[PDB]
Design a binder for this molecule. Structure first.
Ligand SMILES: Nc1nc2c(ncn2[C@@H]2O[C@H](COP(=O)(O)OP(=O)(O)O)[C@@H](O)[C@H]2O)c(=O)[nH]1
Ligand SMILES: [Ca+2]
Length: 307
């Protein structure tokens, strides 16, 4: 055996910027892979592994808003993509839908990951409405192709970022908020793999919840004090940036981490928050971790599928 190998793959411009920001944030025990047609951008990537696709197609330029070029680029470079993926137990593919490279290449990358045996999760954005109808239609086709290629898919409509900014919030700060969805999803899985919990969840439970499902939610909530478990649970399933909310989820992996004070009653409260918000008879895979380093803080991690 071995400790489950996680890789995060950015595809196209937005995907590679997300990768750069995650690397800078400080994510460890995860392999980052940068994939792009655009050689200028790739040269500035902080990823250990860089794959320039479509060298013969684009000659180092981007795909110029043509998803067919992105797709053919990924197909041209299938063997480099396979080699980069090799060894992964789980692959996260992140990309902004609507352009030429991500829209076409990301679903090929996802297909390669899955056909190689990796549990494959996509986290992708839809374009802002101000970008126009063609962009939205191209992105929609990209989303549908991603859905057909991944085990689970998380979609972030960029329009939702307009819900969390004020008129002065810098664009890059809004982009960082979107980054949180993938980054915390990855970190929650990394944490599950690395610690043997008092009620343990491991990579086999992640596979059960995420394999061949469709839409997904991945969230984390942290709270302290009086109603900390309910508050943390509510935060975990809060989805202002998510196309897919908790509502309708029929399978949930939920892990609760706390100090020695973590109460049985609290654990039930948190479970009930998730079950009630889903408004379904949820099949739960429940975990608990006692970290005595923690004091009054409680952390609730949720992965929801089965929509
Ligand atoms: N949230 C977010 N969205 C992005 C970012 N970069 C690009 N986008 C979105 O992604 C779409 C495609 O852009 P890009 O990834 O550069 O295109 P590509 O390189 O040709 O695949 C754009 O239409 C934007 O909606 C980013 O850093 N954050
Ligand atoms: Ca564990």
């Amino acid at each position: 055996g071995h400790m489950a190998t996680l890789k995060v793959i950015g595809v196209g411009g937005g995907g590679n910027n997300a990768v750069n920001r995650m690397i800078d944030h400080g994510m460890n025990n995860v392999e980052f892979i940068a994939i792009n047609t655009d050689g200028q951008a790739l040269n500035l990537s902080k990823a250990e592994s860089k794959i320039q696709i479509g060298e013969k197609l684009t000659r180092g330029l981007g795909a110029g808003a043509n998803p067919e070029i992105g797709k053919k680029a990924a197909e041209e470079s299938r063997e480099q993509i396979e080699d980069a993926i090799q060894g992964a137990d789980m692959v996260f593919v992140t990309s902004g839908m609507g352009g030429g490279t991500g829209t076409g290449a990301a679903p090929v990358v996802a297909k390669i990951a899955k056909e190689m045996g990796a549990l494959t999760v996509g986290v992708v954005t839809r374009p802002f409405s101000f970008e126009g109808r063609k962009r939205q239609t191209q992105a929609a086709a990209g989303v549908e192709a991603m859905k057909a290629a991944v085990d689970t898919l998380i979609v972030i409509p960029n329009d939702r970022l307009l819900d969390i900014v004020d008129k002065s919030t810098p664009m890059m700060e809004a982009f960082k908020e979107a980054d949180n969805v993938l980054r915390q999803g990855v970190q929650g899985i990394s944490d599950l793999i690395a610690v043997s919990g008092e009620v343990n969840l491991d990579f086999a439970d992640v596979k059960t919840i995420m394999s061949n499902q469709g839409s997904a939610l991945m969230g984390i909530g942290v709270s302290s004090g009086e109603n900390r478990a309910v508050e943390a649970a509510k935060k975990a399933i809060s989805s202002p940036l998510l196309e897919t909310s908790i509502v309708g989820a029929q399978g949930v992996l939920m892990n609760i981490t706390g100090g020695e004070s973590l109460s049985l009653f609290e654990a039930q409260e948190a479970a009930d928050i998730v079950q009630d918000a889903a408004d379904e008879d949820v099949n739960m895979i429940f975990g608990t971790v006692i970290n005595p380093e923690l004091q009054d803080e409680i952390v609730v991690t949720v992965i929801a599928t089965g929509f």
